[PDB]
Design a protein around this ligand. Structure first.
Ligand SMILES: [Zn+2]
Lengths: 74, 62, 62, 62
């Protein structure tokens, strides 16, 4: 009843502060929060990424690491 | 049913509270941006005034 | 159980509805500082585009 | 009580879905405005800097 993206965004309510990447940009790239550190996980492929730095692109870094992802295909 | 319409209300609701809690954070990051950027131009309007002052004196020599 | 869950739901719900106004009243405040800086490019485009010019007039003079 | 107090929780909770879409957008809109706006001041700062050095180039010349 309401966009997947926004359901993925809701898992960020607990995301730790001062992470230099957008919650919005994480959920947009298909990743929801795991509740551990700054580790997030793509609902589609199961790809786990953490330790995020400035100018990182979750969208790009997704494509680079697992391009077979039915989701990433967009 | 009411045992269940209501457990549904609980769920739909927590999701909204959680999503709006993320947007609060988003907006306040955005405020720091607008503020940092508004109050920096305060300088940028001074360097501009210094310039056009130098350019007028330089225009009056040439 | 059922009536406590209903009381609380209705308490959450009512406050949530006000938290959001807080939130989007924060959105108006911020948007108001955004348009202030974006108009501060436009005025600062037009004063630098002008001096950029005087200075190529002087440069051509010399 | 319970069954009407409960139907009320449904009417309202249903408006929330849309209230949270709107807020979401508006928060996104503003965050884009603010990040465009803060790359307008990265360049109102470079123009100033390259203009300010053609003037130094000029006044050394005279
Ligand atoms: Zn994936």
């Amino acid at each position: 009843m309401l966009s997947c993206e926004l359901y993925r965004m809701s898992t960020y309510s607990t995301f730790p502060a001062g992470v230099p990447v957008s919650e919005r940009s994480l959920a947009r790239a298909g990743f929801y929060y795991t509740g551990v550190n700054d580790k997030v996980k793509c609902f589609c492929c199961g790809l786990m990424l953490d330790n995020w730095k400035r100018g990182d692109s979750p969208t790009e870094k997704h494509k680079k690491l697992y391009p077979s992802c039915r989701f990433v295909q967009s | 049913e009411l045992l269940q319409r209501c457990e549904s209300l609980e769920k739909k609701t927590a999701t909204f509270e959680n999503i709006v809690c993320v947007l609060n954070r988003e907006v306040e990051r955005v405020a720091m941006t607008a503020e940092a950027c508004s109050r920096q131009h305060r300088l940028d309007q001074d360097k501009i005034e210094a310039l056009s002052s130098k350019v007028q004196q330089l225009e009056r020599s040439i």
